[PDB]
Amino acid sequence: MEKNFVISDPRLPDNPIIFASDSFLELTEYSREEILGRNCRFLQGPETDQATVQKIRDAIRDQREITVQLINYTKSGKKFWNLFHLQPMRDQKGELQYFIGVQLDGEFIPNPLLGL
Ligand SMILES: Cc1cc2nc3c(=O)[nH]c(=O)nc-3n(C[C@H](O)[C@H](O)[C@H](O)COP(=O)(O)O)c2cc1C
């Protein structure tokens, strides 16, 4: 099965990526060594809806799962629609341990409907 996903450590400054799947590197055209320890916001760009980024920010604050569709950019500057699913991961004692984010590329919801 193909799966674009990255894993971040919220107990380190600014939620850095500590693991990225091979297909994520394939989709984003980045190498593994140039995104490790990065915040995933580097995928955003001029066309990224800031109102959608705000929804992600609130979901991380409240440590709840969320699904949004937003524009992301590859290393070479190509735009692609990203159906992004974020999920909190807790340990045996109920403490937040990781965030996992899954990316599906494609304009699943038509943008004229997404803008409403
Ligand atoms: C595990 C994880 C994966 C993420 N993946 C993406 C992503 O693929 N694309 C994206 O635009 N933002 C992604 N984000 C969100 C950004 O890292 C960041 O949280 C978002 O831009 C809001 O934070 P900010 O307002 O500080 O920039 C991800 C966040 C986490 C925790």
Residue numbers in the entry: 387 to 502
Verbatim from the authors:
The dark state of AtPhot2LOV2 absorbs light maximally at λ = 447 nm via its flavin mononucleotide (FMN) chromophore. To determine the structure of the dark state of AtPhot2LOV2, representative of the time series before t = 0 ms, we carried out the same diffraction experiment, but without illumination, on a series of 32 crystals. The first 500 images of 15 data sets could be successfully integrated and were subjected to clustering with ccCluster which retained 5 sub-wedges using a CCthreshold of 0.43 and resulted in a complete highly redundant data set at 2.2 Å resolution. Most residues were modelled in a single conformation A, while ten were modelled with alternate conformations A and B, including Cys426 which forms a covalent bond with the FMN in the light state. The hydro­philic side of the FMN isoalloxazine ring is stabilized by two hydrogen bonds to Asn458 and one key hydrogen bond to Gln489 [Fig. 4(a)].
Phot2 is a high-intensity blue-light photoreceptor mediating phototropism in higher plants. The protein comprises two successive light–oxygen–voltage (LOV) domains (LOV1 and LOV2) separated by the α-helix A′α, and a kinase domain separated from LOV2 by the α-helix Jα [Fig. 1(a)]. In particular, Jα unfolds upon blue-light irradiation, triggering kinase activity. TR-SOX was used to probe the build up of the light state in the photocycle of the LOV2 domain of Phot2 (phototropin-2) from Arabidopsis thaliana (AtPhot2LOV2) with a time resolution of 63 ms.
